[PDB]
Amino acid sequence: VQLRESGPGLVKPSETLSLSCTVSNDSRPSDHSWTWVRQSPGKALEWIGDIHYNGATTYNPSLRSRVRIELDQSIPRFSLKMTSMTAADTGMYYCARNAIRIYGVVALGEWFHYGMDVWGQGTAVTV
Amino acid sequence: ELTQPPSVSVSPGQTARITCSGAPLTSRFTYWYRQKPGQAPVLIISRSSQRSSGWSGRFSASWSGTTVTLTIRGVQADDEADYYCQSSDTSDSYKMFGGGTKLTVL
Amino acid sequence: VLTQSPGTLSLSPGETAIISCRTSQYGSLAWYQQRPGQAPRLVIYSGSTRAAGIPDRFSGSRWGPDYNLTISNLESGDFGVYYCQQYEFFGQGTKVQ
Amino acid sequence: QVQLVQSGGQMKKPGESMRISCRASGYEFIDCTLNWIRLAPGKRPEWMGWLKPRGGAVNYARPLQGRVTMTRDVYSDTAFLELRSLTVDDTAVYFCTRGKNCDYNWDFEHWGRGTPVIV
Amino acid sequence: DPNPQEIHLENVIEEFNMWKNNMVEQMHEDIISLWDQSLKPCVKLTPLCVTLQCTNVTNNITELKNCSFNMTTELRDKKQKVYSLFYRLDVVQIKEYRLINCNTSAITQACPKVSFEPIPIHYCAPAGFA
Amino acid sequence: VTLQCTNVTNNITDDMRGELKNCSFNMTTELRDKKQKVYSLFYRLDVVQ
Amino acid sequence: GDIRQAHCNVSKATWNETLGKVVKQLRKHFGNNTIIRFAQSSGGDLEVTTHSFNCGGEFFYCNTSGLFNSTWISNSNDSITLPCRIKQ
Ligand SMILES: *[C@@H]1O[C@H](CO)[C@@H](O[C@@H]2O[C@H](CO)[C@@H](O[C@@H]3O[C@H](CO[C@H]4O[C@H](CO[C@H]5O[C@H](CO)[C@@H](O)[C@H](O)[C@@H]5O)[C@@H](O)[C@H](O[C@H]5O[C@H](CO)[C@@H](O)[C@H](O)[C@@H]5O[C@H]5O[C@H](CO)[C@@H](O)[C@H](O)[C@@H]5O)[C@@H]4O)[C@@H](O)[C@H](O[C@H]4O[C@H](CO)[C@@H](O)[C@H](O)[C@@H]4O[C@H]4O[C@H](CO)[C@@H](O)[C@H](O)[C@@H]4O[C@H]4O[C@H](CO)[C@@H](O)[C@H](O)[C@@H]4O)[C@@H]3O)[C@H](O)[C@H]2NC(C)=O)[C@H](O)[C@H]1NC(C)=O
Ligand SMILES: *[C@@H]1O[C@H](CO)[C@@H](O[C@@H]2O[C@H](CO)[C@@H](O[C@@H]3O[C@H](CO)[C@@H](O)[C@H](O[C@H]4O[C@H](CO)[C@@H](O)[C@H](O)[C@@H]4O[C@H]4O[C@H](CO)[C@@H](O)[C@H](O)[C@@H]4O[C@H]4O[C@H](CO)[C@@H](O)[C@H](O)[C@@H]4O)[C@@H]3O)[C@H](O)[C@H]2NC(C)=O)[C@H](O)[C@H]1NC(C)=O
Ligand SMILES: *[C@@H]1O[C@H](CO)[C@@H](O[C@@H]2O[C@H](CO)[C@@H](O[C@@H]3O[C@H](CO[C@H]4O[C@H](CO)[C@@H](O)[C@H](O)[C@@H]4O)[C@@H](O)[C@H](O[C@H]4O[C@H](CO)[C@@H](O)[C@H](O)[C@@H]4O)[C@@H]3O)[C@H](O)[C@H]2NC(C)=O)[C@H](O)[C@H]1NC(C)=O
Ligand SMILES: *[C@@H]1O[C@H](CO)[C@@H](O[C@@H]2O[C@H](CO)[C@@H](O)[C@H](O)[C@H]2NC(C)=O)[C@H](O)[C@H]1NC(C)=O
Ligand SMILES: *[C@@H]1O[C@H](CO)[C@@H](O[C@@H]2O[C@H](CO)[C@@H](O)[C@H](O)[C@H]2NC(C)=O)[C@H](O)[C@H]1NC(C)=O
Ligand SMILES: *[C@@H]1O[C@H](CO)[C@@H](O)[C@H](O)[C@H]1NC(C)=O
Ligand SMILES: *[C@@H]1O[C@H](CO)[C@@H](O)[C@H](O)[C@H]1NC(C)=O
Ligand SMILES: *[C@@H]1O[C@H](CO)[C@@H](O)[C@H](O)[C@H]1NC(C)=O
Ligand SMILES: *[C@@H]1O[C@H](CO)[C@@H](O)[C@H](O)[C@H]1NC(C)=O
Ligand SMILES: *[C@@H]1O[C@H](CO)[C@@H](O)[C@H](O)[C@H]1NC(C)=O
Ligand SMILES: *[C@@H]1O[C@H](CO)[C@@H](O)[C@H](O)[C@H]1NC(C)=O
Ligand SMILES: *[C@@H]1O[C@H](CO)[C@@H](O)[C@H](O)[C@H]1NC(C)=O
Ligand SMILES: *[C@@H]1O[C@H](CO)[C@@H](O)[C@H](O)[C@H]1NC(C)=O
Numbered sequence A: 001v002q003l004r005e006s007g008p009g010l011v012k013p014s015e016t017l018s019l020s021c022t023v024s025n026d027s028r029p030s031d032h033s034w035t036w037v038r039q040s041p042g043k044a045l046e047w048i049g050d051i052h053y054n055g056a057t058t059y060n061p062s063l064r065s066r067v068r069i070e071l072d073q074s075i076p077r078f079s080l081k082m083t084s085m086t087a088a089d090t091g092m093y094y095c096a097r098n099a100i101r102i103y104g105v106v107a108l109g110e111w112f113h114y115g116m117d118v119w120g121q122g123t124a125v126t127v
Numbered sequence B: 001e002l003t004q005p006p007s008v009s010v011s012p013g014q015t016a017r018i019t020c021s022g023a024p025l026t027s028r029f030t031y032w033y034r035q036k037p038g039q040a041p042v043l044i045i046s047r048s049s050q051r052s053s054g055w056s057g058r059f060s061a062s063w064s065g066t067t068v069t070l071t072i073r074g075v076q077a078d079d080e081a082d083y084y085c086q087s088s089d090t091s092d093s094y095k096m097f098g099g100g101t102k103l104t105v106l
Numbered sequence C: 001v002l003t004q005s006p007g008t009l010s011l012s013p014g015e016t017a018i019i020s021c022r023t024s025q026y027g028s029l030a031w032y033q034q035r036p037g038q039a040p041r042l043v044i045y046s047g048s049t050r051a052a053g054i055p056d057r058f059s060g061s062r063w064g065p066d067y068n069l070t071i072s073n074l075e076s077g078d079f080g081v082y083y084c085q086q087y088e089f090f091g092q093g094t095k096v097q
Numbered sequence D: 001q002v003q004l005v006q007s008g009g010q011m012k013k014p015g016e017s018m019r020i021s022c023r024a025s026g027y028e029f030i031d032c033t034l035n036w037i038r039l040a041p042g043k044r045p046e047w048m049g050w051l052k053p054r055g056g057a058v059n060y061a062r063p064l065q066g067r068v069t070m071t072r073d074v075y076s077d078t079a080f081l082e083l084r085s086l087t088v089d090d091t092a093v094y095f096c097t098r099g100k101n102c103d104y105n106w107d108f109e110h111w112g113r114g115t116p117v118i119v
Numbered sequence E: 001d002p003n004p005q006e007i008h009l010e011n012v013i014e015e016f017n018m019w020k021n022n023m024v025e026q027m028h029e030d031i032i033s034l035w036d037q038s039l040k041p042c043v044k045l046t047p048l049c050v051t052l053q054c055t056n057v058t059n060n061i062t063e064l065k066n067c068s069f070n071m072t073t074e075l076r077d078k079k080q081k082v083y084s085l086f087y088r089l090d091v092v093q094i095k096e097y098r099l100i101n102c103n104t105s106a107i108t109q110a111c112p113k114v115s116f117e118p119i120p121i122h123y124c125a126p127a128g129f130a
Numbered sequence F: 001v002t003l004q005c006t007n008v009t010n011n012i013t014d015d016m017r018g019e020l021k022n023c024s025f026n027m028t029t030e031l032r033d034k035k036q037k038v039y040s041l042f043y044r045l046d047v048v049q
Numbered sequence G: 001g002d003i004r005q006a007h008c009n010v011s012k013a014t015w016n017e018t019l020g021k022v023v024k025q026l027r028k029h030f031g032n033n034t035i036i037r038f039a040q041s042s043g044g045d046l047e048v049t050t051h052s053f054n055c056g057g058e059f060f061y062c063n064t065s066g067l068f069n070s071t072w073i074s075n076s077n078d079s080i081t082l083p084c085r086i087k088q
Helices: E022-039 G012-030
Strands: A002-006 A017-024 A032-039 A045-051 A057-059 A067-072 A077-082 A091-102 A111-119 A123-125 B007-010 B016-021 B031-035 B042-045 B060-064 B067-072 B081-088 B095-097 B101-105 C017-023 C030-034 C041-045 C066-071 C080-085 C094-096 D003-006 D018-025 D034-039 D046-052 D057-060 D068-073 D078-083 D092-099 D108-111 D115-118 E052-056 E064-072 E079-087 E091-093 E096-099 G007-011 G051-055 G058-062 G079-086
Touching (some): A002 A091, A017 A032, A017 A091, A045 A067, A045 A077, A045 B095, A111 B031, A111 B042, A111 B081, B007 B016, C017 C080, C017 C094, C041 D108, C066 C080, D003 D092, D003 D108, D018 D115, D046 D068, D057 D068, G007 G012, G007 G058, G012 G079
Parallel strands (some): B007 B101
Antiparallel strands (some): A017 A077, A032 A091, A045 A057, A067 A077, A091 A111, A091 A123, B016 B067, B031 B042, B081 B095, C017 C066, C030 C041, C030 C080, D003 D018, D018 D078, D034 D046, D034 D092, D046 D057, D068 D078, D092 D115, E052 E064, E052 E096, E064 E079, G007 G079, G051 G058, G058 G079
């Protein structure tokens, strides 16, 4: 599987910065949670959020208000929009796949995460 | 939210114990990632079954209470890197990432 | 669904009181007596059948939707509030003093 | 002989919960349906629900659904009526009642002493 | 052995009432009697009412309770440690637990060889009835 | 079971009437492992030394 | 192997059709303008709040709240899965 990530690169403060991620050569993408992560330079990984094909999405608290994810399922195109970005909110951004194993009936919540096994190389964004 | 040592130092023949603690760890599985500067993180330790079993011969981990220790044996110079612990909360609403422990080689 | 027409009957001892009742659905109407302080006690069931231990003064029914309880020879053990009953539906109930 | 014995006199404020016991004796407790009636001056008698204390099956009245629970202890022969979110309009006297026979339920022949509840 | 001896009654109108059918009560009594008769000649599990040291089965990292207890054995003067798995509905707290009905009744083990598969049973009226 | 019996408590040396005896014993309970000391007055005609 | 919940499947389309038939037959008795609603069992022991199977020698108690629910107004390879708790 190949995760090709792209975006504007350079944006000014206080507008919306948009990122895109193309999924290539994945059989059955609907069984995995597609996630965005960020990392400021010299700091730890910061989880942005994730989305599943069933419509369920989740965010990081205290940042969720400024962030929203889309996922076009016809062509598996994985998009992010983050509004009201500040000058200090820069660094590397990576699109990734949290693969999900099912072991029983998915309707009963019988699954678990295999972790973010496949990562895109990401893009460095300055604001 | 997820506390681990800032760094650890180990000789080539020594085994590094990278600890990671937090309240949500008392009930949820922990996923261990390794990151090099510039490169994206690669998955090191994950959950391949409901009831855990053996894993690769290297990069193992052990749970106790609210703290999980990443045991890495046979550390070489190529393993100098920032190790991250990741875990869901007790409600499975969001994910926590650790501050990163920089494993260095003496 | 169910109702009782007379509100309060201010009658003296020995007088006969009538308490009417109207039911909009088929059902085995029952008549209960609630004295002051005492718990209610069954008086009539299956429309007109008299419960055991009830004096013979109690009777009254009709084939139509309207029923009425006749209570003759009012004495000290009489009086209080009388309730209609259907399948878990109760009327306001008429008080006799 | 059939007897139903209750414990009452509860004094509660708005918002609190309450539990009323009803010990049955004489008849076989597990072979006859119980009912819970509410009486008060002014307003009509209200049916709270019925309890079949063999399988523990219960039926609640529509105005009280989500507020009223019924339980049965078959070894103490004791029914229990638990009411949540008690408010001023629930001030009333509560009866634990049984029919004349165990085939037709609504000929309430056997009534308990009564359980005053003042909110 | 024979085929069903069904004889149609032309021009007969009969009043039925299922809710006063004594066949229902007879079936209920018979079935309970067969249940008791089949359960009676096997294990009584009176010794099993012991204090169980139970923990969660867990997922090995963090429905069923893994219980342990000192049970009797063939010899009166010997005891053996037994590890088993019970469902949470069968086990109640007194960590220490006990079985749900050990303070109420003696639980009779279903005989291992008898199967609970229902089989068709026909009820036939005795001579002089139909 | 073996009972350790004592004369009923008259609080002084007064004569016991009916020959009631205190008669404690160890007994069993629902759980097979545990035991529960029990004090129960038994008439002397019921109890033999 | 892995610890998994005992569960029971009923076809969704067939069950919806069956509830439609039952609702029609009930409306024949209550009136043609009424609303017929279904809900989970309102209380009692485990034998009455759930559907009891005794199959394969094992006893199941399945949560029938999935089969019921929904309201009927007077006017597929999709299965309803019921969790089932086992009791020895
Ligand atoms: C009521 O109705 C409901 C529906 O409403 C229904 O629910 C259904 O229940 C069944 C129960 O069986 C359930 O099936 C489970 O599915 C799991 C995943 O599916 C995998 O298989 C399918 C189909 O399998 C085909 O091929 C098999 C080959 O042997 C064959 O046996 C089958 O018959 C069938 O032909 C497959 O489509 C999936 O596809 C993924 O994997 C493929 C592998 O090549 C790949 O081609 C696909 O692209 C796809 O991979 C994607 O994702 C991976 C993620 O890693 C990416 O890498 C890829 O790039 C792709 O993106 C799956 O392969 C499956 O887990 C279950 O089987 C588990 O349990 C059985 C028990 O017998 C074990 O034998 C199995 O080994 C397996 O258990 C292993 O895995 C689980 C989880 O991984 C672990 O917890 C276990 O410990 C164990 O793991 C062990 O092995 C692994 C290595 O394999 C190792 O890593 C571990 O360490 C450990 O050693 C099971 O089959 C079905 O999903 C469910 N339906 C729904 C909708 O939820 C009820 O049954 C109905 N009830 C009634 C009464 O009627
Ligand atoms: C009676 O009938 C009525 C209708 O007439 C029923 O009401 C319906 O109830 C449905 C659920 O039974 C409900 O669907 C839900 O709607 C929302 C849509 O936003 C959504 O929250 C639900 O989906 C979540 O929950 C289900 C439950 O299993 C999960 O399968 C699903 O993945 C979602 O959970 C994930 O996302 C949540 C937030 O998005 C998280 O809180 C949750 O932890 C979980 O996390 C996801 O992301 C994680 C990443 O961090 C990842 O780890 C994890 O794996 C997940 O990906 C669900 O679709 C209907 O909307 C509702 N309909 C109406 C009209 O109200 C009622 O229930 C019936 N009653 C009974 C008793 O059956
Ligand atoms: C639930 O259980 C209750 C009993 O607990 C049943 O109630 C009985 O229902 C039956 C019908 O199923 C009733 O019998 C009928 O009663 C009517 C009486 O009408 C009176 O009022 C009208 C005025 O509107 C007068 O015209 C009339 O003369 C009467 O004074 C009659 O309409 C019926 O008679 C008709 O049918 C019979 C059938 O044989 C004919 O013989 C008659 O000539 C006439 O055509 C009939 O008698 C009965 O009264 C109810 N008893 C009660 C309430 O105690 C419910 O039926 C039952 N429900 C269900 C769904 O099973
Ligand atoms: C139930 O608990 C027992 C006792 O701990 C488990 O059996 C032991 O498992 C450990 C490893 O976890 C072994 O070292 C011991 O030798 C085992 N003891 C015995 C007596 O065999 C057992 O695995 C547990 N069951 C489950 C399902 O988790
Ligand atoms: C299983 O049945 C139980 C009741 O036996 C359901 O529990 C209630 O479910 C409703 C609807 O979701 C909730 O509002 C209540 O809070 C639940 N009760 C309790 C005590 O928590 C349960 O939902 C059923 N399960 C499923 C999957 O439908
Ligand atoms: C997709 O990956 C598979 C291995 O999983 C490989 O065989 C195949 O050539 C790849 N296809 C493309 C188009 O890259
Ligand atoms: C078993 O899991 C339950 C889940 O509520 C928890 O409360 C309990 O402490 C756990 N027991 C043990 C011994 O870990
Ligand atoms: C639990 O995990 C350990 C490794 O941490 C493994 O050796 C052990 O076998 C596992 N237990 C079970 C019951 O699978
Ligand atoms: C069994 O008896 C021994 C006696 O020494 C005791 O230590 C042990 O805890 C008992 N086991 C259980 C499971 O109760
Ligand atoms: C047995 O113990 C349970 C524990 O919940 C208790 O509720 C029950 O009343 C007890 N049985 C008897 C007959 O007292
Ligand atoms: C109890 O009383 C008897 C006389 O009835 C006396 O002989 C005996 O010593 C007394 N025993 C004790 C233990 O006080
Ligand atoms: C009861 O059993 C205990 C066990 O330690 C024993 O020491 C004691 O003597 C017994 N008590 C009586 C009154 O027999
Ligand atoms: C099991 O039930 C489901 C309900 O949807 C049905 O589709 C399936 O065919 C059934 N399987 C068998 C073997 O009868």
